[PDB]
Amino acid sequence: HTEDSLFPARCWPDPCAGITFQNDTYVCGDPRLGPVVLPQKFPLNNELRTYARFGALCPAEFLDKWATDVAPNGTYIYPPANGFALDTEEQPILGNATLPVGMKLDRFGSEYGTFLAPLGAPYIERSLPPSNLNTFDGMYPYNYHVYQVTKEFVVGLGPIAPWFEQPGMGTQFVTYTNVLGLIDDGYLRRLDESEYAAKVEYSNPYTPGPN
Amino acid sequence: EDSLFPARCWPDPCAGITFQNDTYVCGDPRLGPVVLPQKFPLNNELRTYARFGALCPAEFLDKWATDVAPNGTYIYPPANGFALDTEEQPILGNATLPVGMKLDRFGSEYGTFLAPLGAPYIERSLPPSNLNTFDGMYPYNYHVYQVTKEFVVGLGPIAPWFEQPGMGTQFVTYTNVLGLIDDGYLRRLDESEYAAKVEYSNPYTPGPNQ
Ligand SMILES: *[C@@H]1O[C@H](CO[C@@H]2O[C@@H](C)[C@@H](O)[C@@H](O)[C@@H]2O)[C@@H](O[C@@H]2O[C@H](CO)[C@@H](O[C@@H]3O[C@H](CO[C@H]4O[C@H](CO)[C@@H](O)[C@H](O)[C@@H]4O)[C@@H](O)[C@H](O)[C@@H]3O)[C@H](O)[C@H]2NC(C)=O)[C@H](O)[C@H]1NC(C)=O
Ligand SMILES: *[C@@H]1O[C@H](CO[C@@H]2O[C@@H](C)[C@@H](O)[C@@H](O)[C@@H]2O)[C@@H](O[C@@H]2O[C@H](CO)[C@@H](O[C@@H]3O[C@H](CO)[C@@H](O)[C@H](O)[C@@H]3O)[C@H](O)[C@H]2NC(C)=O)[C@H](O)[C@H]1NC(C)=O
Ligand SMILES: *[C@@H]1O[C@H](CO)[C@@H](O[C@@H]2O[C@H](CO)[C@@H](O)[C@H](O)[C@H]2NC(C)=O)[C@H](O)[C@H]1NC(C)=O
Ligand SMILES: *[C@@H]1O[C@H](CO[C@@H]2O[C@@H](C)[C@@H](O)[C@@H](O)[C@@H]2O)[C@@H](O)[C@H](O)[C@H]1NC(C)=O
Ligand SMILES: *[C@@H]1O[C@H](CO[C@@H]2O[C@@H](C)[C@@H](O)[C@@H](O)[C@@H]2O)[C@@H](O)[C@H](O)[C@H]1NC(C)=O
Ligand SMILES: *[C@@H]1O[C@H](CO)[C@@H](O)[C@H](O)[C@H]1NC(C)=O
């Protein structure tokens, strides 16, 4: 049976073939391939439980498919229409929607970005490349950030197209102000780890019931 | 500390619930099974699941069902549970599912609602009773499928309901699962076909043109 591992078994004896080794923090020494050390604690370990980082590809095959160059100057190519899933007419599926006070969001990336997901979404639902897992600030291992909506605001809301050898099909929220702006104007607050450690903190007390 | 009921619900968490059957929490099948899955991937999909949110059982049924009494039935969201935009219209479109895509579902094959394989239970906005085992061959009412021929579904984000945040994606098929299988559009997957991490990745979507 298939055992889980960093590389597909086919990639040995030299899975890093064609990859310029730069820094041993990263897989094959290449920051585009994400960090060697993966999270061992909740919720990150839950979010990465289904993550085969290269799918069935080897590292250079993965870069050749999803980036402009296997060499270090290659950059990842991103999907059209901001990565929203496309309908049968090749039009993105989304709508402007209001996020309610209390809603918890998370993100792999700096606070200059504009793309978030609902708290706890699996990594493979986000169609993100391996390098979004790289640590840039020691206060935020894996560049993972969690926020809670403190004042209602409108975002582009819709399903995530598959990309980077993953199925996608989470939901993404594309904001019209970066995360820093939303924090400064009182739309989001940062949650620390103790505010998303318990199961009940993932449930929804803010949506009212019918009648 | 995680637990079945919130701490405030003791010493009588099942107050107001008529006990019917000890397979279910408080003996009520509407509140889901006592024994939760211990195997991958159901355990991964339920790791963030607080079954009642911060509510007690009777409060939960009072909010989401017509009656706390056993004749009460769950009330479901408008517009087939799609997230609504700022004009209260559901967000969705018709989309073609590609050959190789894996889907899963809690429910019988007379149903039409599916999600991407491995979506967390709280992303599905499903009540606790969708975890109830109805056929012993399918514990927890859980089914996995793989697209064997392209077909068009309604596709869109899931609105919050049932004290959960939603915001997974749902696929609403125009033919029930039985007819999709009979016509060669879906195939049933054994648990051995979704046991390894690589079986959750995507070999079917082509890369960008360069
Ligand atoms: C507590 O509730 C469970 C579940 O019952 C269902 O849900 C409740 C809420 C009510 O709506 C019921 O009407 C529902 O049926 C009961 O479990 C059932 O118990 C009966 C009696 O022991 C079982 O009947 C047996 O079934 C055998 C075959 O079972 C297998 O195949 C069937 C399909 O053919 C499948 O459904 C089942 O899961 C097995 O895989 C059969 O050989 C035998 O002769 C007899 O008919 C029935 O199978 C049970 N259902 C389930 C889903 O386990 C409990 O009995 C009930 N307890 C009490 C104390 O009331
Ligand atoms: C990654 O980098 C390589 C190497 O190029 C060098 O580094 C770049 C960052 C730039 O600073 C380049 O100026 C620098 O040379 C790129 O390869 C280069 O691509 C160009 C265009 O495809 C090639 O142009 C060629 O011209 C030569 C003659 O000089 C012809 O033989 C070719 O047929 C073609 O016309 C150039 O040869 C090539 N260099 C090498 C060593 O292969 C690469 O394009 C770049 N990748 C990306 C995505 O930018
Ligand atoms: C590999 O990359 C990391 C990250 O860029 C480098 O770590 C930095 O190290 C310096 C000290 O040398 C610190 O001041 C920085 O804060 C670190 N950045 C981090 C942790 O993100 C590391 O030095 C690099 N190693 C090699 C051999 O190039
Ligand atoms: C969503 O709305 C956009 C414009 O909205 C206006 O400007 C933004 C920045 C917010 O301030 C919003 O509250 C304002 O009403 C449109 O450009 C865009 O096309 C809309 N998208 C869809 C899918 O309708
Ligand atoms: C999606 O398309 C619907 C009609 O599609 C046709 O009929 C259904 C029953 C399926 O067999 C489908 O494959 C066919 O192409 C419309 O009724 C519906 O409004 C459409 N939804 C949109 C455009 O959002
Ligand atoms: C449940 O039964 C009680 C008693 O018969 C009744 O008063 C109540 O209206 C019923 N609820 C529903 C939703 O029918």
Residue numbers in the entry:
A (entry chain A): 23 to 233
B (entry chain B): 25 to 234
Q: Which sentences from the paper describe this structure?
A:
These toxins invade cells and act as NAD glycohydrolases, cleaving NAD+ into Nam and ADPR and rapidly depleting the cellular NAD pool, ultimately leading to cell death. Intriguingly, the active site architecture of the bacterial and fungal enzymes is conserved, but their structural superimposition reveals the presence of a unique C-terminal calcium-binding motif in AfNADase, which is located at the edge of the dimerization interface. In the present study, we addressed the structural and functional role of calcium binding by introducing mutations in the C-terminus of AfNADase that precluded the binding of the metal ion.
Interestingly, the KM (88.3 ± 12.2 μM) and Vmax (2956 ± 157 μmol/min/mg) of AfNADaseD219A/E220A were far less affected than the AfNADase NcC-Term. The two α-helixes, forming part of the dimerization interface of AfNADase8 and dimer 1 of AfNADaseD219A/E220A, are unfolded in dimer 2 and rather form a loop-to-loop interaction. In dimer 2, the entire catalytic domain translocates ca. 2 Å away from the dimerization interface, also showing major rearrangements in the loop (156NTFDGMYPY164) containing residues Phe158 and Tyr164 8 that were earlier observed to be important for substrate binding.
